Amino acid sequence: MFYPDPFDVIIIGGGHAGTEAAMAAARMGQQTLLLTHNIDTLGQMSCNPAIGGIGKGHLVKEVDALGGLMAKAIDQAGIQFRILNASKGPAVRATRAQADRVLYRQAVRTALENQPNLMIFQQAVEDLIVENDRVVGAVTQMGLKFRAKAVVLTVGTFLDGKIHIGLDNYSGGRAGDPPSIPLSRRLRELPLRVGRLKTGTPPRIDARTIDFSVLAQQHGDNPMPVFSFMGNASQHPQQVPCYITHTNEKTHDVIRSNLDRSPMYGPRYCPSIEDKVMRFADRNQHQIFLEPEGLTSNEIYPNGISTSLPFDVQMQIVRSMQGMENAKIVRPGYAIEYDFFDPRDLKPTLESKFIQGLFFAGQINGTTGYEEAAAQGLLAGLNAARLSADKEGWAPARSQAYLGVLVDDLCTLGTKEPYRMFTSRAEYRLMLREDNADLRLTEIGRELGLVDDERWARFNEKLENIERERQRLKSTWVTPSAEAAAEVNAHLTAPLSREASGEDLLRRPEMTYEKLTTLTPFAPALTDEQAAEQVEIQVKYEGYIARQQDEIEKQLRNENTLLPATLDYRQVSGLSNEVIAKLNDHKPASIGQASRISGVTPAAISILLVWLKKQGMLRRSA
Amino acid sequence: MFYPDPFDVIIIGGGHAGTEAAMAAARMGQQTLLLTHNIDTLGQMSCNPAIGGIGKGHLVKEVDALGGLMAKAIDQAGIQFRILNASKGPAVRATRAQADRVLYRQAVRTALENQPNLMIFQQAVEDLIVENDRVVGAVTQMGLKFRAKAVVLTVGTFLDGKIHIGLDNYSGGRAGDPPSIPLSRRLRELPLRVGRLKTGTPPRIDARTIDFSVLAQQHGDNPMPVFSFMGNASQHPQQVPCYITHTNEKTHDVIRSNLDRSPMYGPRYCPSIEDKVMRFADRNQHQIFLEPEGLTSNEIYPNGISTSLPFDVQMQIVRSMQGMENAKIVRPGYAIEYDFFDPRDLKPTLESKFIQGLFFAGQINGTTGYEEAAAQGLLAGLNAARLSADKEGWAPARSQAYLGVLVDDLCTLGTKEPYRMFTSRAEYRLMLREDNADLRLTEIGRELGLVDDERWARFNEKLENIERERQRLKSTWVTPSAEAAAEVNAHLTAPLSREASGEDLLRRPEMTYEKLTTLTPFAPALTDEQAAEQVEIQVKYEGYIARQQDEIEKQLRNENTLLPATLDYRQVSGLSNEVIAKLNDHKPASIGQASRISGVTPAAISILLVWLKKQGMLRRSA
Numbered sequence A, B: 001m002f003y004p005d006p007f008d009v010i011i012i013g014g015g016h017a018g019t020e021a022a023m024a025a026a027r028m029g030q031q032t033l034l035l036t037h038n039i040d041t042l043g044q045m046s047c048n049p050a051i052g053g054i055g056k057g058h059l060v061k062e063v064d065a066l067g068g069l070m071a072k073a074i075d076q077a078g079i080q081f082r083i084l085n086a087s088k089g090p091a092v093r094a095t096r097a098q099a100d101r102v103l104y105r106q107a108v109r110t111a112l113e114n115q116p117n118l119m120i121f122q123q124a125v126e127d128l129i130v131e132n133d134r135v136v137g138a139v140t141q142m143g144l145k146f147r148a149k150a151v152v153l154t155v156g157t158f159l160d161g162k163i164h165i166g167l168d169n170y171s172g173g174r175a176g177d178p179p180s181i182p183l184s185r186r187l188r189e190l191p192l193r194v195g196r197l198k199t200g201t202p203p204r205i206d207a208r209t210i211d212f213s214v215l216a217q218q219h220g221d222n223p224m225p226v227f228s229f230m231g232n233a234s235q236h237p238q239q240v241p242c243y244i245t246h247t248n249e250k251t252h253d254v255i256r257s258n259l260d261r262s263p264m265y266g267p268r269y270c271p272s273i274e275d276k277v278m279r280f281a282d283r284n285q286h287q288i289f290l291e292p293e294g295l296t297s298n299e300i301y302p303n304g305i306s307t308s309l310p311f312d313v314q315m316q317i318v319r320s321m322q323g324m325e326n327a328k329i330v331r332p333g334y335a336i337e338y339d340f341f342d343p344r345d346l347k348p349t350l351e352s353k354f355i356q357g358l359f360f361a362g363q364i365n366g367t368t369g370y371e372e373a374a375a376q377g378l379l380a381g382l383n384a385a386r387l388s389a390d391k392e393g394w395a396p397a398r399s400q401a402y403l404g405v406l407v408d409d410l411c412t413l414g415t416k417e418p419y420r421m422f423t424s425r426a427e428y429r430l431m432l433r434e435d436n437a438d439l440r441l442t443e444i445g446r447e448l449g450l451v452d453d454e455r456w457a458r459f460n461e462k463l464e465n466i467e468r469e470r471q472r473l474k475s476t477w478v479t480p481s482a483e484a485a486a487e488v489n490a491h492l493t494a495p496l497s498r499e500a501s502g503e504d505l506l507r508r509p510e511m512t513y514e515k516l517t518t519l520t521p522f523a524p525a526l527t528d529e530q531a532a533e534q535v536e537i538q539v540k541y542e543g544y545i546a547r548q549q550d551e552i553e554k555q556l557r558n559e560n561t562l563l564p565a566t567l568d569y570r571q572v573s574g575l576s577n578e579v580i581a582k583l584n585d586h587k588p589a590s591i592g593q594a595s596r597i598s599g600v601t602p603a604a605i606s607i608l609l610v611w612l613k614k615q616g617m618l619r620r621s622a
């Protein structure tokens, strides 16, 4: 029954969050154990085979900078690479890759399979062990049960999910996988609140039944970009293009005629295609993408045609488009409904506020997307391994990582939509960029021992480069009567009228970095342009960064002021009943987090501070 | 409900038999449809990751010679290659390959995914449609149902299987896959007889917890062999070795002490390890192999330590061996029990004798092993596509293929062991070799259109080579007083005493082929030694082949004399009651097949022939 070796941390579920949690826990020198249903599914993509995008590439870069694997399994599995918002400011660009599925699966499995201090085990779980608000050990299906000092759950969408097609349904965790039914009941009996969500995916087409000779092609950028701060372009496999098609009035007529057979007729947008036509009935054209699932299989994923209509309607819609006159379907489209937990009963370190040692990550945190789970899993594993070693935990803030924004929003949003990350959703966009993620996370990774020697050496060299470039550009001066100033004045507007300097010379918006590096002064730029772009970003954004920094420094006291979960706001005088109910329901962790809740005003926080000072539950508030 | 396109043949289950059936049916120019649970499992190996062996390599060669895929997916996925019985006569050699699992899975999937006239579909089946002893169409789970002129079932071990560990059990098709429960009931209600069998598999070890520094290594053959008659050695990936270890008295003591916890305490041999110790208690040492599952994962398969004991005993046995003092297990060992059909109610063309159009192949035919299913599936698909096109079927005999022996034995054996192919199990070993499989099967493949142009050209060139070599060796003559005969007499015993010839010169057993080719006469051999070995085999085995040929030619009349399944042997005078019951139970297809049944004597077949002549159910018997 009892396994004769105790472990530090146990992860239940090796999906997109469990793998990151296990890697982070094992790399931090703690004995790690990973339980999963079945192997060879590690790294499986059950949806659109794409990685990154607007708001998703930032999370990938954050995971990579702190010692992740998602950004390294994609450099050897991407079949198309593009940069989004390339023409705009560097703070908003993103990198999106159409990925070969098998290469990604194998990179993930092989990287995870050779990780020291970690062991994997193929078995389901059926219950957990808890006494005195402490979780110790998990129970498998055969009868064998383990013991550990910390447990992380990364079930995802397998918590008692049903597949829905048309008006019919059947049990299933996804296309071809079984459901984890009893664990749903076992977690439900625990004092938690559980709900249900539903999302769908379109069918798959056969590439040798589509006449691509009349379909428009689309390509990526000529210089293929990279995700990780370590690899280069020599690791990418061969490239393939994508095909673009459209719909026509016959498709809309068929959808409207057969709209009766649907469970519906809901997010604030339109995920399906019948929603696309009904919400906007005047539009008569839509864009559909056809992209290959890999360079060695002829299955095409259609993007933009997701629905929940029965099979006959699916076939008619597929067969009523240009280039799809005679098409075959290998995998029908379908939706799924799964359980989740409301993210208002766990600490910002992704630990349940009621149980000691229990952690949550992945889809069960009311989110969606591959990138929205890896960061949660990595942070959960980090905190779990810190706790098992009896040291203080860690959690990022809204001003240094998109993960901090994601956690804070999931804690104090209260909406019902699946959480999708967007660039504008964060208030510190101008500094929370992609190229500087390592510059603001790898030192923390090194302090907690998540970063090995190669990354440390690379970052030290890069920082030395940046500092030397800053100093040398600060060490130049020009005058209008300078011997070489004729050409300087020639190709620069507003010619020099006083002592000039490169740090001030570049302040003009029209000038660039490489142009200034090509000059009689301002000697040739350093060979590592990856470090060179940093100085350009800093000089262009110095004013806004300074304003935001002195802004952030002011709320630090409210960030530090903690509020214990045992607090009973009914014992506070001067606060309205609605505010008391709201604060009792949310149970924030800090006064600043409470202030971010909708419905609380500065009067409420002032009265709360007065009450805290009265009860002595605060050392000081300055 | 009804799918708007009718197909020629539908295969249910894309495993090891379904893929071959689909490829054979599609390559024969018939619209083929393949239903499966889930994709990315095509080519999965759920047991010892090895291909070929004694009696299994012959089946692989037969499948390859007739247009199969198993021999082509192994040349790009094998991590170790060996020849068994290399020192013995060429009629008994075999080729065994330790295979990388992922490369095999991907080769299979990519080869199957680009097959013209074939389409794949991911869905389970829940029932079949039959009227007036005819099967037309199958019903899926969602509700969509198809129509076809022929149906082939390749379920394997998923017909309502239970996983067993120790004294506990749970439903499962295998480790990580769901069971197909309702189809078992639907097939059971049909007038068939169904039974249950059980087999097990050992656990998996982690390669980075075993001290291989004190373990013996094993190697293959430097001159690498080949499976397919098309590829070469340039397609094989990098090679890895295998590790050898043993057991000791502590393991036996632990097994004996904890023998009480076992469902048992059965084949005529010992599959498990507790059987190994109990059946032979005097032996105190056993051989265990540790082999890598691939060149990119550190999971080790242990061969020789299969059992059904609970997990604690498994861990003790693993930890009580040299080099395994501190070992980890990633996948526990387990057994499974599954349903099957008794192979006495189907024609030798793998068609049920009662239903029209229904075919059986794979594990449901009471067999085991990868190679024992591919041939069955290929022949079933061949016969199904012949039937759907309204042409006469085909079935090999015992004298031209191991498939004929396998089918004949499964029809008229009556034992209960899982059927394993062995070389000595066939009575025509001396001609049913491996190197000549194409020479006796590819012309039939071409006649039925299973062979494309490349194989046809290669075989035509090879046959031309063989014929020219035979003629040139027949066109030589030597004399004792020949000018170059001094050396001939020097290195050959019994010097020439009369007119000699190479067709007679090689008749000496000590002489070889290459030695004669490097002589004054008998000019250098042809560059294609693959054709050159054939003439050596023919000249060494001519007498035995001639004897066996004139033997086989005599039973052809009994082979041709068919016996309809509607025959009622109770209406025959002069036969004993036991013989009547036996013949009614078996219902053979031919008088020769009936004669191969145990318990019938030549008197019975003579009386049967007399009765057939009386009733006029035979044209003639000569």
Ligand SMILES: Cc1cc2nc3c(=O)[nH]c(=O)nc-3n(C[C@H](O)[C@H](O)[C@H](O)COP(=O)(O)OP(=O)(O)OC[C@H]3O[C@@H](n4cnc5c(N)ncnc54)[C@H](O)[C@@H]3O)c2cc1C
Residues within 6 Å of the ligand: A012, A013, A014, A015, A016, A017, A018, A035, A036, A037, A038, A041, A042, A045, A046, A047, A123, A124, A125, A154, A155, A156, A157, A158, A174, A175, A180, A183, A199, A200, A201, A334, A335, A336, A361, A362, A363, A364, A368, A369, A370, A373
């Ligand atoms: C029908 C469908 C629709 C989708 N729609 C969208 C969409 O609209 N938008 C979008 O962004 N993404 C969508 N997706 C993709 C989805 O977000 C991801 O595939 C996945 O849910 C995110 O990964 P995860 O780690 O959070 O969960 P998963 O990858 O589902 O985590 C499950 C993994 O953990 C293992 N596991 C789980 N529970 C246990 C347990 N108890 N014991 C042991 N092992 C366990 C499983 O074996 C598996 O390996 C969709 C997927 C499907 C199938």
Ligand SMILES: Cc1cc2nc3c(=O)[nH]c(=O)nc-3n(C[C@H](O)[C@H](O)[C@H](O)COP(=O)(O)OP(=O)(O)OC[C@H]3O[C@@H](n4cnc5c(N)ncnc54)[C@H](O)[C@@H]3O)c2cc1C
Residues within 6 Å of the ligand: B012, B013, B014, B015, B016, B017, B018, B035, B036, B037, B038, B041, B042, B045, B046, B047, B123, B124, B125, B154, B155, B156, B157, B158, B174, B175, B180, B183, B199, B200, B201, B334, B335, B336, B361, B362, B363, B364, B368, B369, B370, B373
């Ligand atoms: C526990 C265990 C023990 C084993 N022991 C041995 C042993 O002792 N000796 C040995 O030689 N081999 C052994 N094996 C290996 C086994 O013989 C092969 O893995 C396999 O059973 C033979 O392949 P098959 O094609 O006959 O069947 P399978 O590979 O089992 O065929 C199943 C395939 O068909 C599909 N399928 C099945 N039914 C349906 C359906 N209704 N609809 C759609 N798709 C369907 C499945 O999705 C799957 O792809 C063992 C395997 C296991 C798991």
